[PDB]
Write a protein that binds this DNA or RNA. Structure first.
Ligand SMILES: [Mg+2]
Ligand SMILES: [Mg+2]
Ligand SMILES: [Mg+2]
Ligand SMILES: [Mg+2]
Ligand SMILES: [Mg+2]
Ligand SMILES: [Mg+2]
Ligand SMILES: [Mg+2]
Ligand SMILES: [Zn+2]
Lengths: 134, 122, 104, 39, 135, 50, 103, 84, 58
RNA sequence: GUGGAGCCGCCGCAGGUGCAGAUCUUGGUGGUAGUAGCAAAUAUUCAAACGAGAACUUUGAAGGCCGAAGUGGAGAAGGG
RNA sequence: AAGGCUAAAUACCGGCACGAGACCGAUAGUCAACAAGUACCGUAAGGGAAAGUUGAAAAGAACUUUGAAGAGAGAGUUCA
RNA sequence: CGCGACCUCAGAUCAGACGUGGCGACCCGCUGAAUUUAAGCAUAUUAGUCAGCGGAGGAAAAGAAACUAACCAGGAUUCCCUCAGUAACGGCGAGUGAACAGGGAAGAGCCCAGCGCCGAAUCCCCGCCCCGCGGGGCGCGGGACAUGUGGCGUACGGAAG
RNA sequence: CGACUCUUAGCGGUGGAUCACUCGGCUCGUGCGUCGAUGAAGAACGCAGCUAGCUGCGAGAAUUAAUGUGAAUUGCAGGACACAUUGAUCAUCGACACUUCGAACGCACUUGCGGCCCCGGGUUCCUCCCGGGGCUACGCCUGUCUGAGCGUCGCUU
């Protein structure tokens, strides 16, 4: 149950803060879970997805053992595009059909200098949760 | 050719205005490229040079207002744009010194009869 | 119904002119220029008897009846016929005033 | 445009004559013919 | 006394309100005098005033004023009460001793037409329907 | 009028620039519901009133 | 307008009373605003006693109430004079002073 | 002569736009405005119309400077810069 | 050219002589009804316009 | 049968609680009706061209009109 | 008495932020869920609207064929 | 006749400050109806409200008795519950209409002119410094204010020596 | 026989009710309670690569700097991907800048007409010579400077 008297619980106002989100808050709500292998090597649960992570789709019309990298992150439509899952148009032109990153499992991260520190910050705070158990 | 404002701070005034009027020449001749047919790769150059031309004018104005705030530091009667803004009503309050003033009758009253601390059981 | 639905300039057309004697809005141009204004019939009108915030919302019960009601709510929570007929599956449970020790 | 008399214009207007039809007819009592019925 | 400002003495109302010519203006003439002194000099603060003459048509009051931003006034904490911004235009609000003699306030049985604050603060509190939450 | 002052014809220049249809690249944008300029003024029907 | 055997009544609603209406919806909200103004006043001061100074024994006026004893305002300088404490010392001892009171 | 033919003679303008409110209410001969009453120092507003206040009070413009004052209040109106 | 609307013909005469290095005979301005000022800058007969236009782009 | 994401029974509780009328309000659509009307200021005709298409566009020839207080040629105000 | 200052308990249908509801559900609820004090009206003071919804995803019907085109007939997308 | 002092006043784009205008839910000062009610209508009621005008502040105003009381007496102001639809007002008709006790919420008290005393013991401005950050001073030296009275101690609960 | 008319039913059209939805109101409450001559509220005008409105901004104009954040913005283009430079974008915002009217302030409001002071060049300049800068509203307080009076008086002559 929510106890804080300074955070909402109403349907109209969490939706309004969802679709009118700032574009740096919006990379946080477009987070995706790490794979079972890769959450054990880093002891972290989930990550915000960036442009060049290898990924497979875990639910939808297009799913099942399809590692392949994302190629475009529409934050405006809350949608990542992945380089293999595609769709022919009526024209014969082929386009990327887009999916939501919660329906998606990262299988290989792209590390830079900053995505080391985002991992280590989310990892070091998880021993502190285990250190509460006295 | 990018322009960083952190790089421009160690420059001289005879170098900044020379590099600013240099940028006004490219912004002149890119406007010519828009009134003709067009060279559309140079029609997206116009936005990044007109924001580059604001970065030089900013460092000129920031290293002049603070070059001159160090001049009137330690001075009575500094100009109006160097005085704190704070709102119109803040300038017309007394100050932190005058609001602490107590008259001599109310000073001996406070040192002869100070507020005591106590409690009531025994 | 906040202030009122009475923030409209409107007079009755009054006389003949083959319209009902409801007030009409003033002016011209716009759609809303000869339409029925305030009164509980009109598109955009004011509701009948607009609710007020000084309705008596709260009720008093004298305290001897509040205590009476809570003694009857405890005596029925021990009879197994009444507690099961409210739907609580208490088939497998032991003795109906369930008492666990103060360690819990 | 190539699609502006076809896809701008049929949206542009096409219901703009709808200013009220009638704005009352304030012509002050068309029974100006004095009739007055036997007095 | 004041004449009622109405064209040709015609007040257009009920016969109790034909009062064009015997009307007395419930604030005093000294209070008028302090008012248009603190209205000309809007930077000065007004303390009070006193009587120094009358003829038959004119009446002469000396109004004493205070510059709130002079440092002889903004020092000396026995005078710093009037350089505090709630004392702005004390006669447009009727707060000096000339103007408060017409507010009708004071302690006693003769003055409990104004028994909370002022006359219109009593009226609001004698005429609000104080319906409670449990009633 | 052909004898007009400056604040008239820079008021009239503003009304003349903003009488133009929507560019056709905004119908393709994400989540608009505009489909024609509905603030369009024609010079015989609706007049500015100076 | 009247009817059978009833009460002749004067409802004082002949005046525009719906503007001057007072609803007590903030009244639980102000009860926990002046508890928190008592709690954050108790812990702010000292081990000095809450609810302020010592009040005197005072008898009520006016025939109806003159058989009861009420808490008063101060301590009436004569009583401070006999007890031996000074009039300007007394209000930081925790003792209320009402100089206009007569004994 | 009373009606449609007297509309032809309507040829010269009574009101032009006011410099303080932009209204076409500045009467040329009275030299005053309808809505604001321009050559008076104060603004013309009346409690006998609640809509006319709704059109032109604060909060209906850009608020070029009260946007900033409403923002600077919630930090206590600082003067000196931030640390790096 | 098209000039900023607050420029008189002296400022135009010096701001074309200094930018483009040409002698200016006379200037005839105009407010064209989109709201921008147009200037007609005539050159000295020593110069030519069809080649000065070539080195300013067009 | 259509439709595509929510809903209902019983026991109590609470109402902005059920329409045929108010020359009701708002929106919609009929009969009238393919009707009344497209009738002030004399007038058009032939060929060709352009065109998917010509009583009406342009061109040429004819017959006419306004007839210098013009159905001509310029402006002020107003329009923009 | 005919001079002056003074906190708290009190007020707040404007403002800046919040939180909640036995509230309304697009003729309702703010006039205004939308480019709304907008378009438009009036010389002016002023009056003042109407207007929410494809799909899960544009995948918004390529191509063939009739027509000058609007408009069709096949095909095609889609669970539809 | 000239010069000086002061007293009444002028002028300045003099050095430095200030005020104007907006918002106006709440607050203060003024001003002020009529519809309505009385089954008509004048007084009355509506109402000291609407509209009008002027001033603020985050609160405002009020506030330490020229008070209530009439007895074993209470003790600034403000708010709440009662008093009380009461005393009283009123074509004594329609209607209007407080307060004091009492129970609470909160609680805080002071200063001055006067009368006397102290060699004006007082204040403002300018100049350079003690020495400073984020700038205000107690120190030094000059110009003024001021005896037609600045300052200290004093306030009716008495005060001073 | 056909047609017309009438009533039913299927299908189709017109129309937009109902139902389901809701980035909106509305009520109550809490916390703070902040404009302006250092130029406010409001208005006008302008600003984007294609951009009318809305929204945001002011010739530094769809935003600059700084801090925080850490790869996008996106209708299509274009461009730097550089981040063990400085780093896209977004938020915060304490630094800068902020056209014209407006209490609006040189005077007028007709983008009209000035006055002094200064500066870069032309008569190397006074007596009205281009551009740029500065100043010029009213009321009023303290101080200053200038000085008016058959006001009061002194020292004189
Ligand atoms: Mg909500
Ligand atoms: Mg009851
Ligand atoms: Mg003026
Ligand atoms: Mg304020
Ligand atoms: Mg509808
Ligand atoms: Mg930046
Ligand atoms: Mg100049
Ligand atoms: Zn105006």
């Amino acid at each position: 149950m929510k106890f804080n008297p300074f955070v909402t619980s109403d349907r109209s106002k969490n939706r309004k803060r969802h679709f009118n989100a700032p574009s740096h808050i919006r990379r946080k709500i477009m987070s995706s879970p790490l794979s079972k292998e890769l959450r054990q090597k880093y002891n972290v649960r989930s990550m915000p997805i960036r442009k060049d992570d290898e990924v497979q789709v875990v639910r939808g019309h297009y799913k099942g053992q399809q590692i392949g990298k994302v190629v475009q992150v529409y934050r405006k439509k809350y949608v990542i595009y992945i380089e293999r899952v595609q769709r022919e148009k009526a024209n014969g032109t082929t386009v990327h059909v887009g999916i939501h990153p919660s329906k998606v499992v990262i299988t290989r991260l792209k590390l830079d200098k900053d995505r080391k520190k985002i991992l280590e910050r989310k990892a070091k705070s998880r021993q502190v949760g285990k250190e509460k158990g006295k | 050719a990018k322009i960083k404002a952190r790089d421009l701070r160690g420059k001289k005034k005879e170098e900044l205005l020379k590099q600013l009027d240099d940028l006004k020449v490219e912004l002149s001749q890119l406007r010519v490229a828009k009134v003709t047919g067009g060279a559309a790769s140079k029609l997206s150059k116009i936005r990044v040079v007109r924001k580059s031309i604001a970065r030089v004018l900013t460092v000129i104005n920031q290293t002049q207002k603070e070059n001159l705030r160090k001049f009137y530091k330690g001075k009575k009667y500094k100009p109006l744009d160097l005085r704190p803004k704070k709102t119109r009503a803040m300038r017309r309050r007394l100050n932190k010194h005058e609001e602490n003033l107590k008259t001599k009758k109310q000073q001996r009253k406070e040192r002869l009869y100070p507020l005591r601390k106590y409690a009531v059981k025994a | 119904s906040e202030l009122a639905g009475h923030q409209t300039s409107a007079e009755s057309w009054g006389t003949g002119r083959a319209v009902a004697r409801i007030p009409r809005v003033r002016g011209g141009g716009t759609h809303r220029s000869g339409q029925g204004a305030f009164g509980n019939m009109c598109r955009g009108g004011r509701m009948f008897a607009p609710t007020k915030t000084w309705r008596r919302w709260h009720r008093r019960v004298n305290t001897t009846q509040k205590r009476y009601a809570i003694c009857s709510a405890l005596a029925a929570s021990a009879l197994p016929a009444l507690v099961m007929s409210k739907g609580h599956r208490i088939e497998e449970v032991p003795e109906l005033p369930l008492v666990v020790e103060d360690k819990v | 445009g190539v699609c502006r008399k076809a896809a701008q214009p049929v949206e542009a207007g096409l219901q703009i004559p709808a200013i009220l039809g009638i704005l009352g007819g304030i012509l002050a009592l068309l029974i100006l013919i004095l009739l007055l019925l036997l007095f | 006394g004041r004449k009622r400002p109405v064209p040709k003495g015609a007040t257009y109302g009920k016969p109790v309100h034909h009062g064009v010519n015997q009307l007395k203006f419930a604030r005093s003439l000294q209070s008028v005098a302090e008012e248009r002194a603190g209205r000309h000099c809007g930077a000065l603060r007004v303390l009070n005033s006193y009587w120094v003459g009358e003829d038959s048509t004119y009446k002469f009051f000396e109004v004493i004023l205070i510059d709130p931003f002079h440092k002889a006034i903004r020092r000396n904490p026995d005078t710093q009460w009037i350089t505090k911004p709630v004392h702005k235009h004390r006669e447009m609000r009727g707060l000096t001793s000339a103007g408060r003699k017409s507010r009708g306030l004071g302690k006693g049985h003769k003055f409990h037409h104004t028994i909370g604050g002022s006359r219109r603060a009593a009226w609001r509190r004698r005429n609000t329907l104080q319906l409670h939450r449990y009633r | 009028s052909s004898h007009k002052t400056f604040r008239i014809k820079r008021f009239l220049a503003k009304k003349q620039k903003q009488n133009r249809p929507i560019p056709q690249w905004i119908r393709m944008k994400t989540g608009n519901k505009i489909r024609y300029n509905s603030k369009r003024r024609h010079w015989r029907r609706t007049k500015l009133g100076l | 307008a009247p009817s059978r055997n009833g009460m002749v009544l004067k409802p004082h609603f002949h005046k525009d009373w719906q503007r001057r209406v007072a609803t007590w919806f903030n009244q639980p909200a102000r009860k926990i605003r002046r508890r928190k103004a008592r709690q954050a006043k108790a812990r702010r001061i000292a081990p000095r006693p809450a609810s302020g100074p010592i009040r005197p024994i005072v008898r009520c006026p006016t025939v109806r109430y003159h058989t009861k004893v009420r808490a008063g305002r101060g301590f009436s300088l004569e009583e401070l004079r006999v007890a031996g404490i000074h009039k300007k010392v007394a209000r930081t001892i925790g003792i209320s002073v009402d100089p206009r009171r007569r004994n | 002569t009373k009606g449609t033919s007297s509309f032809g003679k309507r040829r010269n303008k009574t009101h032009t736009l006011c410099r303080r409110c932009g209204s076409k209410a500045y009467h040329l001969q009275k030299s005053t405005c309808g809505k604001c009453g321009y050559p008076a120092k104060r603004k013309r507003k009346y409690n006998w119309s609640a809509k006319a206040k709704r059109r032109n009070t604060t909060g209906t413009g850009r608020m070029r400077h009260l946007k900033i004052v409403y923002r600077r209040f919630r930090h206590g109106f600082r003067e000196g810069t931030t640390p790096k | 050219f098209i000039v900023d609307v607050k420029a008189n013909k002296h400022q135009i005469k010096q701001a074309v002589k200094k930018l483009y290095d040409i002698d200016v005979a006379k200037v005839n301005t105009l407010i064209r009804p989109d709201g921008e000022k147009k200037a007609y800058v005539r050159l000295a007969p020593d110069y030519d316009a069809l080649d000065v236009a070539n080195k300013i782009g067009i």
